[PDB]
Amino acid sequence: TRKNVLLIVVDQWRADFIPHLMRAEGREPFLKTPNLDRLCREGLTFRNHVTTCVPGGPARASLLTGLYLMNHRAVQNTVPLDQRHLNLGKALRAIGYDPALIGYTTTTPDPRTTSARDPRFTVLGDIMDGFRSVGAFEPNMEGYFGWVAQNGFELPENREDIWLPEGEHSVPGATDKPSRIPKEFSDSTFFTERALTYLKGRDGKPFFLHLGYYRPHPPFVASAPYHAMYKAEDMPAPIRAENPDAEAAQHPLMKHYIDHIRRGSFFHGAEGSGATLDEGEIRQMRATYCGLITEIDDCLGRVFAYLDETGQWDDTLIIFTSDHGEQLGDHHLLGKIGYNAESFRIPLVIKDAGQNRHAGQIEEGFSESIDVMPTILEWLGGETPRACDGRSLLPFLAEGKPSDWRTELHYEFDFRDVFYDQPQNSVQLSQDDCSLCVIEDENYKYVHFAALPPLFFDLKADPHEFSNLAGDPAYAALVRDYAQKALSWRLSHADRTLTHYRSSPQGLTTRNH
Amino acid sequence: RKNVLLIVVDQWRADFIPHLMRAEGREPFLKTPNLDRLCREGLTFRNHVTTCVPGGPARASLLTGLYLMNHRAVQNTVPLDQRHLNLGKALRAIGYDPALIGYTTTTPDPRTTSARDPRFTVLGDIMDGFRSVGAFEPNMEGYFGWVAQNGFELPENREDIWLPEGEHSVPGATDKPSRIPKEFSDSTFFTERALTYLKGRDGKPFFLHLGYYRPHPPFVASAPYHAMYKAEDMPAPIRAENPDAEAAQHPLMKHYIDHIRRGSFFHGAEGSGATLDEGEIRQMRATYCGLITEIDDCLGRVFAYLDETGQWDDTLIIFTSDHGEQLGDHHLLGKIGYNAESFRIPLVIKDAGQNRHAGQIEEGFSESIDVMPTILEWLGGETPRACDGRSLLPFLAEGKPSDWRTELHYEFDFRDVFYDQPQNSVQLSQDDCSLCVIEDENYKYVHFAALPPLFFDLKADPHEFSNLAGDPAYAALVRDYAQKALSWRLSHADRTLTHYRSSPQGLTTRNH
Amino acid sequence: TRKNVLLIVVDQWRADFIPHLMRAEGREPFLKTPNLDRLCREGLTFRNHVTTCVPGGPARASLLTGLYLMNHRAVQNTVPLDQRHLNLGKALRAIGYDPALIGYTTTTPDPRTTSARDPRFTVLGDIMDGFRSVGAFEPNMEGYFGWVAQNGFELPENREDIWLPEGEHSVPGATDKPSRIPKEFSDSTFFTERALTYLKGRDGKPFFLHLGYYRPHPPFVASAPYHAMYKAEDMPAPIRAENPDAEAAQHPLMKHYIDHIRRGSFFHGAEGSGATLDEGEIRQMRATYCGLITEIDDCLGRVFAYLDETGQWDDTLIIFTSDHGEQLGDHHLLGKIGYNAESFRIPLVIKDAGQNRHAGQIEEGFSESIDVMPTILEWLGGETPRACDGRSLLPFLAEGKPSDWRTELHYEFDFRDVFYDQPQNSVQLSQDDCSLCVIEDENYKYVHFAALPPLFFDLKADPHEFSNLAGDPAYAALVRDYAQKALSWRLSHADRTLTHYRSSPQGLTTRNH
Ligand SMILES: [Zn+2]
Ligand SMILES: [Zn+2]
Ligand SMILES: [Zn+2]
Incomplete structure (x- = not known):
């Protein structure tokens, strides 16, 4: 009996850019993803999924280890992933699968096990040990540019200028130019x-x-015709406070990012404050983002076609997900940072082999990126490792949400200094005190900071996280409650590597509960 | 010439230190002349806790500088991941031979030794990285063989040496040797x-x-120490009305009242730990002080030799205990649960030369995890990046650093081991069988992972009898303490490699 | 300031198929290699280079760890390479260089660090830890066949039938058809x-x-026009004994190979004994072989072009070599097996950066495959690892053969049973007793078997190893001496990982001599 697994991981693709969900609410989608729509219509779409941390580094460690950031400790880009952790690659080999990977993992190696002069300590990160590279973006995008260059296309002196907008009158920034x-x-x-x-x-x-897939990561410009596919005027408007400073007043960390995020990191060549983009420009960006998305869909079309021609479609568990979200103007922010919902909320669509008993349905239960790895391994016939924080989603494809499934979503962010950003100057804390975790459900969101003020949000009243209730004595019992949830979640998720073992007079044994 | 002598007694309570009784205005109800010497020449810390219990967790913490949340030796019989740097490995790195006497109760790492390894057969064994120079060994063979070789005839069952004298003497709290x-x-x-x-x-x-094993039970003493102290001159137990009144506080308290047996504290006895009368508990307390005095006599011998050989003034001497002991407080026997008497332990540090703070009594919040960093840096080493603890040296200089902790922290995991199954009582799987405590001079907040939490007003209720955590009026304070606990967890996430960075320029490191 | 190393490693390319050397000898070259000729013209050609063992797995282990087989213990294909041993990839990372690799290493993994179900324990071998893979043959050649399918070429049901000769009924075997x-x-x-x-x-x-490069490894068939590039009539005749049995009678190991080697392992779909190919057939094979070589040369042309276009040629150390030789019908043998010189004799051409001071010259010092890795590491500024048996060749590019250079060539062969061949059933030995070492110089060759008769050849009289002297009482002193040399070699090349270390009153120290 042949079983395949196709993990599709896009980068920076938001939860609320999925047509199938827009249609279930009664809206007409403002972009087209027919091939995704096929996955959706044939499988289970998760409405409330989050990556358990950002940015790419941490998000991928969580995704490829089943571990929360509190256990995997790859806390930012450029920070080492301890190699004691069992990654998805190594696990698949232990059950006979060759762990083929295309893309990147943005992983920083363990310094205890490699020379200080290793070239991999020179870039953001590189491919995780344990996978077989079959198409790397590679450090500095060289895999791609080499491939472009070997295809006879002549690149510019500064290679990334392929992403300048076309035409010698076109200003870098949001653009309608390809x-x-x-x-x-x-x-x-x-x-x-x-x-x-x-x-x-x-x-x-x-x-x-x-x-x-790299896309829809920035820079926000697209090859023709994807640049003009969608109109700014059809894109939803950003959700934000009256101006950048009103937003910054919410929290010191919010202020650092508002004050520091650059347009140049989202549009090649562009200059100035990401926060000062006007509504018109954010709309355009957004339409470019939709183009990039539809191109991926066209691309998935080719991969699906080959599976159909070779009779493999019904043999393949396809998972479609993103590593993290993106602010895309929301709260005056670009990128993925901080505590806002849009940075963490990502898509998840799972198509089982065969005809899916829940095909086309939309699952509301709270899932987390740490759940993916356990799902795949269980589906391929293996055991979920003991160390994993996550749990297999396979029951959702069966009877449904288990009766003991989590009742809240959990995520983390660590903002210690790295070579391109120094939150610590703004916030005046040392590196071991620069983190937060979030506890969120249908009615409330609690953001707890290691050593800065907490935030609490009534999502019925204030679903876009504009009004901090955390200092309001009237909410003491509620914030207590959520702090207590958060605390119990930590206790219950301390490292599990060896804690199921026991010495006994009858020798070394294992405890299963 | 720099020496270090770490005296780790077992089961010795914070509040059985004469020096502290005297400063409080009391007459010591026991004598410890030699420890009294240390306190007079040294610094005594009055608010010191082990960051966990029982003996393997407490010692993993003590010997690694890590909270239970990072060392993960969460109970006796649970392995200690060998990734963690211990005191002995660290000492070798700065050129000290890590000589050890007694025991560490460490369960080894399955990934680096065979399942048939004999050490997976006992509670625990000496930790990798030390030089054993006098092992209690497993099953206490090191001691017993020493008794046999000295020509003393041992009974069929060796542990019957701690049966009380006389063929008509009742096992239990006893006045007999x-x-x-x-x-x-x-x-x-x-x-x-x-x-x-x-x-x-x-x-x-x-x-x-x-x-030292003592004052670990059995609560029985060699002559003359059995009689030395009187049951009429012992402090009374602080406890509720009856077992059930206390049981009713929390489901874990129920578990322990309902299961602690007397045989774990007096050899050959049986019946319930909770149902001892105050008369018996005091007799016990008399035996305990006896065993305590016997240790003191012993240290006299060790200190004497130090004096003879001119080494006393070069030797950092640290006196401490792995954990406390209830002694019938709250109708409990042993070191379990959340009550402060299981966790509060002694610490007395005598520096080299003449001590700047000789005889003084430090009030700052010290934790067992601080001991290792203290030793290492005293001998010229670094405090490892990974340690949760902090060097105590500044207390022996100018005093409490302006950024010292403002709360005490301690944890307890109560998952099923082979001789006690708290999971049956409380109905939780193992990964939810834990608590942490957060305590200052005014309140204590005991947070459970998956059972109701506890909150105490330490002023009005210094002995933890009235849970206030469900009082709506206390919402804001209970929040505050969950909030502190949550910040501590975040701030103390594993730090092994979180200080490194990659960069255009290669591998580097942040100090701050 | 800028320093590039290109290490070119072909497969099964004999040392006596190098035009530069043929011209030096006075012979009109029977094949063409202009691009290799350019390297020779500009660099140093070593006429007495050998691989210290065969076949692929073992030879590569030697090349890439600087260790003799007596120390790396990757004694055959399918036998694990202990990961304690430091390879070229890992060394290069420690001096700042990315270990990009194309081709394959046929390395069997170390079972103590990898699961028993790892798919790499299912093929002859796979890529060695430590290298970045940027162009894999992959297990099964999948990487290649994937690249053919994707170029739009329609592969046969049995993919490898691309190597059947052209035509509805052309007989598989030595061929003139493309x-x-x-x-x-x-x-x-x-x-x-x-x-x-x-x-x-x-x-x-x-x-x-x-x-x-895979070529000129078999199968011996070439794409058009390489199939007819050269004529049988112009190919050197095979050197062999009068008949197979006569060849066989020299030694049980030879007899086992004569009796078992099949034409199918060298011509795709062919049948019969490789031993029984007549000379016409062998000359045809030699011509096709030259076919594949000149195809390689043509290819090096494109690579050299790009270094020339980009101004890199003068900044690049180019080392050209092969993993092992090929009997190519000599002694009635096909492949790389046994003790004969042509299985071990391989090419080495080294162009230093700038204008090489020995350009065109032909070095006669005895070089071994193990010397390549130290050479590269010293040239890039690093140190020869202490474990290495090999030694740096850079003095040859400086003043000349060091005054204490080896005075003999050493190589080794282990013939324990693997899944696809079982010499133990012929020679009746257990696997730890199935090895030979060779010691050879300009005048004598000694072949020492662990548990079979030894062999001794006078290479002036008998340069082709037809007349074993080892049992002639008149050569007892000479055989003694070569056995003594062999022994001394074993003793001086025992594992050096930690033997330079010492405890002392002062603490741990190192002894440089
Ligand atoms: Zn990303
Ligand atoms: Zn103890
Ligand atoms: Zn080969």
């Missing part, structure tokens, strides 16, 4: 061709493949 | 190993962990 | 393409690249 690279040499095409190459090599033998 | 003379006591044994080690060193610099 | 794959999709073009991709991605940044 990029300077053709769609047949887009990074999304690059990864897709690597998938097709790999799958064709396999020639019907069972596979695991992590298919990583 | 043990069936072994003091010259073959376990405390005499450990002391003889200590003296052998020290004399072998012949003046060369030294680290030594001098472990 | 293969059924166009040259634009040959394996040689695949490895090349991946090379160019890699270099184009680097974009001037210093690099290390292991550029591996």
